[PDB]
Design a protein around this ligand. Structure first.
Ligand code: FES
Ligand code: ZN
Lengths: 52, 119, 54, 77, 86, 295, 193, 168
């Protein structure tokens, strides 16, 4: 009943959370838009046709 | 089992064999399978008319009122069964789908009339 | 008003319990403040996009 | 169904779902029906919620329940 | 098998001998006839006035084969088979 | 003012109970069912008398006469009419509240017709749905074919009237039209063929006496009791008749003459009884035979 | 083989040809199956007749073409039912084929439905404890106001023509994606003449 | 035959005949009896016949026995509140003991029927499901309703094979 520890599962979890706080994208990158193709280059996703 | 988030829902769980559908009303978690595990069975619905030409619907109103008071949602087909019964109001789209049917059938009466009249 | 069925089940409990009354059961919708669908929500409880640029 | 890591198909790349047409009359009439229907149901839900809170509090803290818990303790002595 | 079968079938006590032995009424209880007591045999001699002493627990030797069946534990793929008329 | 006794009155229950009598051989007739090896007990004379007494206590619970009710009123009630749903469906929905802790005569069962009308289900539909979700042993959804005219006559021909009454009590409700029709028809066949003994020592005898009395057909029964040395029951039948019909020629005549015992039969035989002549002859024969035994 | 008792099968059991062949015993008494071992198979052969051809050892029903399994021949259906428990024997007991044992169970159940065959009918208890129709469920309910005036339960079931200023908002809200405005619907459902 | 003396004790039919169902307060029951002495006769029979009956009805109650520790037999119960119930069982039969503890610490017949009735509501007859939990699996087992296609084939107009063909 004594669970064998998983240390690598906790190490990466802390590293990921940290990197998400130091490499976090800004609103300038996230909410950018190409006004010709009408797509956010960050994710390459098209906007809805009603917002064009 | 433990699901991330989710909530309880009163939906229909399809049953029966091919070309013979039979739904059983149940309260189950939102993420659980359609015909999987449920919390409680609160009724049953037989779409196919019986010998007398009538569709049967069982409802445990005493228990449906218990789960709706505990935070349970409802599915659209199940909200249309409670409106047909008088437990809930007639769902808005049950009304609009009827108006669309009226206008549609009145649109066919013109062509039918014109053909018989013109020709 | 209460819908047809629920109305019939609340009027029958009255008569079964002995209470005799001709008043109509009705739902108090004054508490329910229905806001429009375009009402500003809370942004301090809203999520954010993750850092996976494509 | 797919996952976050699975890629996208090449036939859905150049796909655009155009929204349906709108009937000005029906759209407004239908937008009011949902407004009332959902208010009529929000009241019912609150009623049923009050009944589940009552019974529970009644069961653990009730007149009859506390009238029987004392009888069992008095009969025990 | 034959010498023992005829042996036990001849040393069996009837309902009449039992009553005469203990001077009591032999009553038959049937589920189909409800609680009706059916008198199958009565003693020819003087009927005793005192009842038999009711026994809390009887010290009678049991058979594990019968007890194991009454408890739904005797599994067998050869018992209760459909056979011809006998 | 002055209410006429009902079928459940203590005075009438005792009278109909005594007429029925108690017969253990017929009350606990061996059933044709799955059997087990019987169990035997060594009993004394007193232990045997107590066991025979416990069978009498249990037989009076098996002879409990069912209550007699009147034909229930049809159900014609509309909760709502939604004309907007008209034409949207071809068949009707039958909703049934299924909650365990509710009596079936307080249970809500509604019907949404294709015209958008939300009415309550009729008696025929209520009893049918209650059997789908709360089945009862012996009852069937679809009405059997045994209760038809031709098939019922067959059962009568085999002297199986008590079997037809047990089928009718397990398939229909006491206040249903079919429960009354089937019972009344059976009562009218017995009166025709004089088979009153069949229902004796049963729970269907009182209900049969209650029908002949209210419809004045106690001539045949009253004769049979006399032919079986059951004067006590024969006189109680005339006493009962007088009670339910106080303003009758026999009832008024009795008061004037203060008739008692056998006299009541004579007063009733001449004044109101249809078969006055036959009764007097039958009563005559009995009284003569009884005199010889007294000697 | 055309049996003369086809229409009136109950006359063959009360004849002398049946008594000279069977006597007082049932038709399945002098029948034994041919199987390997002491324990026989738990199912009998599907049928003794295949395309107007009879097998070597037919069953008690298929060997005599004058025995017709009908719900009216009560005297033949009693030989396949226990006189002490009122239960129909399984096929291995009598030796009949499945095809005829399926026909017997029907005829035996159809004769009990017509009152021709005697069977145990128990004395059950009533379904309900009370027999009082003093409840709305079974009685009339006060018609609601909207039902007496011929009005819907809720006002928003009926079509209500919205103002013009509100439609212009929608038209402006959905410019270039629009559909022809629909007027109030007809009062009742049209029908195809 | 079955080993041991009085083999009926080792039967389910005899273990379920006990009428002593302790309450929730009772946690521990300690029995102290003497192997010899005419006075302690009943206590020995109570340990030989009934303790099996008591433990089968009260499986969550600890029962511990001690031999020849005191000159006289006695029972002692330990409740959850800290109260102890001493019971002198000297000069008494096994039946008197079994009947005495049922009156001071055992449940009555009114408290038992209630619990049982609750269970009956756990199996709703209207529900449809496996034979283990529910009486019926599908609604085709109900006469009047449409049978299962396995037994009675459906009409050609009610099968999706031809609905598609008739339409196209
Ligand atoms: S099981 Fe009910 S339809 Fe096949
Ligand atoms: Zn055959």
């Amino acid at each position: 009943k004594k669970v064998r520890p998983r240390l690598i599962a906790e190490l990466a979890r802390r590293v990921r959370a940290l990197r998400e706080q130091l490499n976090r994208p800004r609103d300038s990158q996230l909410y950018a838009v190409d006004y010709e193709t009408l797509t956010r280059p960050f994710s390459g996703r098209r906007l809805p046709v009603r917002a064009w | 089992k433990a699901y991330r988030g989710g909530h309880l829902t009163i939906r229909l769980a399809l049953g029966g064999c091919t070309n013979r559908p039979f739904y059983r009303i149940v309260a189950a978690h939102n993420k659980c399978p359609r015909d999987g595990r449920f919390v409680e069975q609160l009724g049953s619905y037989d779409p196919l008319p019986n010998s007398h030409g009538e569709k049967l619907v069982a409802l445990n109103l005493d228990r449906i009122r218990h789960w709706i008071g505990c935070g349970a949602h409802l599915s659209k087909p199940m909200e249309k069964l409670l409106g047909l019964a008088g437990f809930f109001p007639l769902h808005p789209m049950m009304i609009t789908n009827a108006e669309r049917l009226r206008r549609k059938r009145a649109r066919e009466v013109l062509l039918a009339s014109q053909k018989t009249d013109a020709e | 008003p209460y819908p047809p069925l629920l109305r019939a089940m609340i009027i029958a409990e009255r008569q079964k319990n002995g209470d005799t009354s001709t008043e109509e059961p009705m739902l108090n919708v004054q508490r329910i403040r229905m806001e429009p669908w375009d009402y500003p929500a809370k942004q301090e409880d809203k999520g954010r996009a993750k850092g996976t640029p494509v | 169904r797919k996952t976050r890591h699975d890629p996208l198909a090449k036939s859905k790349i150049e796909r655009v779902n155009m929204p349906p047409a709108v009937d000005p009359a029906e759209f407004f009439v239908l937008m009011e029906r949902y407004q009332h229907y959902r208010q009529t149901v929000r009241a019912l839900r609150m009623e049923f919620v009050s009944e589940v809170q009552r019974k529970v509090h009644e069961a653990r803290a009730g007149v009859l329940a506390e009238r029987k818990a004392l009888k069992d303790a008095a009969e025990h002595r | 098998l034959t010498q023992g079968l005829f042996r036990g079938l001849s040393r069996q006590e009837t309902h009449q001998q039992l009553a005469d032995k203990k001077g009591l009424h032999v009553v038959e209880i049937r589920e189909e006839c409800g609680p009706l007591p059916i008198v199958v045999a009565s003693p020819r001699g003087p009927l005793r006035k005192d009842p038999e002493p009711e026994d809390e627990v009887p010290d009678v030797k049991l058979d594990w084969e019968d007890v194991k069946t009454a408890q739904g534990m005797k599994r067998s793929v050869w018992s209760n088979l459909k056979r011809a008329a006998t | 003012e002055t209410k006429k006794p009902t079928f459940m009155d203590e005075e009438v229950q005792s009278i109909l109970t005594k007429m029925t009598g108690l017969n253990l051989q017929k009350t606990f007739k061996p059933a044709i069912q799955e059997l087990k090896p019987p169990t035997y007990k060594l009993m004394t004379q007193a232990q045997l008398e107590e066991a025979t007494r416990q069978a009498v206590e249990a037989a009076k619970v098996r002879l409990k006469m069912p209550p007699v009710l009147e034909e229930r009123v049809p159900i014609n009630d509309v909760l709502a009419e939604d004309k907007i749903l008209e034409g949207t469906e071809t068949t009707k929905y039958v909703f049934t509240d299924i909650s365990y802790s509710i009596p079936h005569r307080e249970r809500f069962i509604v019907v949404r017709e294709p015209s958008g009308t939300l009415r309550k289900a009729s008696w025929e539909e209520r009893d049918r749905m209650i059997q789908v979700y709360f089945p009862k042993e012996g009852r069937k959804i679809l009405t059997p074919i045994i209760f038809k005219e031709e098939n019922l006559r067959t059962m009568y021909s085999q002297d199986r009237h008590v079997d037809v009454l047990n089928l009718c009590f397990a398939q229909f409700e006491p206040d249903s039209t079919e429960y009354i029709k089937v019972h009344h028809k059976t009562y009218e066949d017995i009166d025709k063929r004089g088979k009153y003994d069949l229902l004796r020592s049963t729970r269907y005898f009182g209900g049969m006496v209650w029908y002949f009395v209210n419809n004045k057909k106690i001539d045949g029964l009253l004769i049979d009791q006399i032919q079986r040395d059951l004067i006590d029951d024969a006189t109680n039948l005339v006493q009962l008749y007088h009670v339910l019909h106080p303003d009758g020629q026999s009832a008024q005549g009795a008061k004037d003459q203060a008739a008692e015992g056998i006299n009541l039969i004579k007063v009733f035989a001449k004044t109101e009884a249809q078969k006055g002549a036959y009764i007097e002859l039958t009563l005559q024969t009995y009284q003569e035979a009884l005199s010889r035994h007294s000697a | 083989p055309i049996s003369p008792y086809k229409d009136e099968p109950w006359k063959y059991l009360e004849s002398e040809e049946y008594q000279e062949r069977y006597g007082s015993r049932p038709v399945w008494a002098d029948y034994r199956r041919n199987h390997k071992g002491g324990v026989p198979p738990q199912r009998t052969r599907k049928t003794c007749i295949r395309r107007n051809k009879v097998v070597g050892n037919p069953c008690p029903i298929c060997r005599d073409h004058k025995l017709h399994v009908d719900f009216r021949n009560v005297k033949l259906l009693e030989q396949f039912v226990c006189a002490h428990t009122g239960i129909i024997f399984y096929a291995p007991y009598t030796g009949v084929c499945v095809k005829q044992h399926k026909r017997l169970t029907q005829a035996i159940q159809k004769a009990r439905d017509h009152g021709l065959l005697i069977y145990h009918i128990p004395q059950v208890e009533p379904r309900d404890l009370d027999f009082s129709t003093s409840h709305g469920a079974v009685s009339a309910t006060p018609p609601a106001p909207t039902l007496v005036s011929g009005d819907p339960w809720y006002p928003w079931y009926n079509w209500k023509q919205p103002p013009e200023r509100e439609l212009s908002r929608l038209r402006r809200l959905y410019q270039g994606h629009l559909q022809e405005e629909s007027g109030p619907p007809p009062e009742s459902m049209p029908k195809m003449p | 035959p079955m080993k041991g003396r009085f083999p009926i004790r080792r039967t389910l039919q005899y273990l379920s005949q006990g009428n002593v169902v302790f309450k929730d307060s009772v946690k521990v029951m300690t029995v102290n009896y003497n192997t010899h002495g005419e006075l302690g006769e009943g206590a020995r029979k109570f340990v030989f016949f009934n303790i099996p009956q008591i433990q089968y009805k009260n499986p969550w109650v600890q029962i511990m026995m001690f031999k020849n520790m005191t000159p006289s037999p006695f029972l002692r119960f330990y409740l959850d509140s800290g109260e102890q119930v001493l019971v002198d069982v000297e000069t008494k039969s096994n039946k008197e003991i079994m009947e005495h503890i049922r009156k001071i610490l055992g449940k009555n017949e009114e408290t038992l029927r209630e619990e049982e009735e609750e269970k009956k509501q756990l199996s709703h007859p209207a529900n449809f499901g496996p034979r283990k939990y529910c009486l019926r699996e599908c609604i085709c087992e109900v006469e009047g309703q449409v049978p299962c296609p396995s037994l009675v084939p459906l009409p050609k107009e009610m099968r999706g094979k031809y609905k598609a063909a008739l339409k196209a």
